[PDB]
């Protein structure tokens, strides 16, 4: 319940990494 | 024109050093602050406030001199030369640590004069004064540590002294009695300051290697020194580089240069919040759950539990001479030791 929280929030950070690299705004 | 107008335009001549209305608070206060440090770290003793020596006349070198703090019995006293402790005697005033306060207070108002100086200078040239706002991070640090923190302690004796070894001592002191590395606000300070140094190195290098005019001779004839640069490199070659190395880059020069301003400043501000919290000795010292788990099962052992033992050590072996006014005497059978566990 605590270990779960740690790994869950980390899982969310790496998903954030993925989207910020391959799905970023076009530069207009 | 009246005399006021004549005074005002005398103060704002174009000249080598700018005086200004702000100058009147800055320059005497700065001179006396700085000069007090010097006259004190050369001559003034601390045999009467701590039982130490700290000046050149007594023997000491550049790293081990200091102007040191008052004794613990003096309370939060101002330590005026005309106050009811010195009573108009410059010797006692030096002997009682009275000029630590002189330095501190004069330097505090010198700080205030400097930030005002940045405002009215920037007002004169008519630019936004972000650098005056950046400079309130150093003021936050100064007033939260050198003024507010011992005003939450019982005396100015637990304030840091102006000197190299005295503040090296402050580092080890805080490590031992507050376990200040394990406080999230100092962690946020460390992240901010290190990130500032990171942006600094990366930006310098990136710009120096995307220069225009690498071939034929300079087609840049100005600076125009107040522009800093930013004309002398191509945003597009750097942005294209860092999109492939790191996978994200800035595409807006103004926002890059705002990030560089935001990072160290929010950094200093957060560590200020934490240390004004230590001023009422509220300490994130321990995780309650870890202590319980270590009590019930004594084969549990953590890098954290080691840090606690080490800090116990710092306190126990440093206390009697760092607080020689308490009169700690520890028989050697009560001090903590590794071979005794």
């Amino acid at each position: 319940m605590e270990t779960i929280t740690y790994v869950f929030i980390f899982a969310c950070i790496i998903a954030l990494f993925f989207f910020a690299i391959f799905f970023r705004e076009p530069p207009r | 024109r009246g005399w006021f107008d004549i005074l005002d335009d005398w103060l704002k001549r174009d000249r080598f050093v700018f005086v200004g209305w702000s100058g009147i608070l800055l320059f005497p206060c700065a001179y006396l602050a700085l000069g007090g440090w010097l006259t004190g770290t050369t001559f003034v003793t601390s045999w009467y406030t701590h039982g130490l020596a700290s000046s050149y006349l007594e023997g000491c070198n550049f790293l081990t001199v200091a102007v040191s703090t008052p004794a613990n019995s003096m309370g939060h006293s101002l330590l005026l030369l005309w106050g009811p402790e010195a009573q108009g005697d410059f010797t006692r005033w030096c002997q009682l640590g009275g000029l630590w306060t002189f330095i501190a207070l004069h330097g505090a108002f010198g700080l205030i004069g400097f930030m005002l100086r940045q405002f009215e200078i920037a007002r004169l040239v008519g630019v936004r004064p972000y650098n005056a706002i950046a400079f309130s991070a150093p003021i936050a640090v100064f007033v939260s540590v050198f003024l507010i923190y011992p005003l939450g302690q019982s005396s100015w004796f637990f304030a840091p002294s102006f000197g190299v070894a005295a503040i090296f001592r402050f580092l080890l002191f805080f490590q031992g009695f507050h376990n200040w590395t394990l406080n999230p606000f100092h962690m946020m300070g460390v992240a901010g300051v290190l990130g500032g140094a990171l942006l600094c190195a990366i930006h310098g290098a990136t710009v120096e290697n995307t220069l225009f005019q690498d071939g034929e001779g300079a087609s840049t004839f100005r600076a125009f020194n107040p522009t800093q640069a930013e004309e002398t490199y191509s945003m597009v070659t750097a942005n294209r580089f860092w999109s492939q190395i790191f996978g994200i880059a800035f595409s807006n020069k103004r926002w890059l240069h705002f990030f560089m301003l935001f990072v160290p400043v929010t950094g200093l501000w957060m560590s200020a919040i934490g240390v004004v919290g230590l001023a009422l000795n509220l300490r994130s010292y321990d995780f309650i759950s870890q202590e319980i788990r270590a009590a019930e099962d004594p084969e549990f052992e953590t890098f954290y539990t080691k840090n606690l033992l080490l800090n116990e050590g710092i306190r126990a072996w440093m206390a009697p001479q760092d607080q020689p006014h308490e009169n700690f005497v520890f028989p050697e059978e009560v001090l903590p030791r590794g071979n005794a566990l």
Binding site: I21 | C60, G196, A201, R254, P264, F303, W317
Partner: protein, 335 residues
């Protein structure tokens, strides 16, 4: 159709892809993948690690009742020393995990990967026709990486004295290092601290000055690229106040009035600072320590007068007596 070796050799050396993959990258990717994946699994669920060779292990894993601020990957045991110690050097897996092999696996894979990262930076700069030596700036963190993970263990003679990979681990390393080598009084760390406070200061200043000067910038932009004239307006006047105070001294210290040197100075200051402190930890691995001032002042009756450095030496004793459990009679030590 184009002979798969050239399709491979074109696809790798392409500067048209989302993220560059280099010839160095072909080494960077599996080493970093190993290091990252082994670290996540180990920071969560590595079994307790005997690190002193006395059979008393130190926990370091979230599932074993730690939070992340008290977690770490715990270095290898004191019996290993400098020995290479892969999986096949253990006769079972559980003694491998008990001896702290995962740490060694991680730190070797990371060091390899970091050098390849520096290499790949040089390669793309060469490819795009840029100037080189952004990597020269990057050699400052690589140098400290080397000093604290490789050089300091070799000097002390064991990979059990390296910096643990964790939050409280890192702070434990700092405390027990100050205790024995007295680094605050060592100048090379001082040049380092100066570099870091100075780097933060110059970062703040550069940001504030530029971000008030710029009014607006513009460039035409098309449906996949950028335009033809990168346009900007900046203010170009100033008062004799700042010229006589700050300007006269940056131009005197650059020994050039060109403002080209400004960003140059900007790059150089943290990097050089951090080089010297990286030298500090390296030379301290060979048991050459910082200053100690003891009994600098005595009176003429032979009684010592304490200094502000003696309070520090007392705390050094304090930490040091707790950091030996080995005997009561530790006489002269390290190494």
């Amino acid at each position: 159709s184009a002979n798969l070796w050239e399709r491979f050799c074109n696809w790798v050396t392409s500067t048209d892809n989302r993220l560059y993959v280099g010839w160095f990258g072909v080494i960077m990717i599996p080493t970093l993948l190993a290091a990252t994946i082994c670290f996540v699994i180990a920071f969560i669920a590595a079994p307790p690690v005997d690190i002193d060779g006395i059979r008393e292990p130190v926990s370091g894993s979230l599932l074993y009742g730690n939070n992340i601020i008290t977690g770490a990957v715990v270095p290898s045991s004191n019996a290993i020393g400098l020995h290479f110690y892969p999986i096949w050097e253990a006769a079972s897996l559980d003694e491998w995990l008990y001896n702290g092999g995962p740490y060694q696996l991680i730190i070797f894979h990371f060091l390899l990967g970091a050098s390849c990262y520096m290499g790949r930076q040089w390669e793309l700069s060469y490819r795009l026709g840029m100037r080189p030596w952004i990597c020269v700036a990057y050699s400052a963190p690589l140098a400290s990486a080397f000093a604290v993970f490789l050089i300091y263990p070799i000097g002390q003679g064991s990979f059990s004295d390296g910096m643990p990979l964790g939050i409280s681990g890192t702070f434990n390393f700092m405390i027990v290092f100050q205790a024995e080598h007295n680094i605050l009084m060592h100048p090379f760390h001082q040049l380092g601290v100066a570099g870091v406070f100075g780097g933060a200061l110059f970062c703040a200043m550069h940001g504030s000055l530029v971000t008030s000067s710029l009014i607006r910038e513009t460039t035409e932009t098309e449906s996949a690229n950028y335009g033809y004239k990168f346009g900007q307006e900046e203010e170009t006047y100033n008062i004799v106040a700042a010229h006589g105070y700050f300007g006269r001294l940056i131009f005197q210290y650059a020994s050039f009035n060109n403002s080209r040197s400004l960003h140059f100075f900007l790059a150089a200051w943290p990097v050089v600072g951090v080089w010297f402190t990286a030298l500090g930890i390296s030379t301290m691995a060979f048991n050459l320590n910082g200053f100690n001032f003891n009994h600098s002042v005595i009176d003429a009756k032979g009684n010592v007068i304490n200094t502000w450095a003696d309070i520090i030496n007392r705390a050094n004793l304090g930490m040091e007596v707790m950091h030996e459990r080995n005997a009561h009679n530790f006489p002269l030590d390290l190494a």
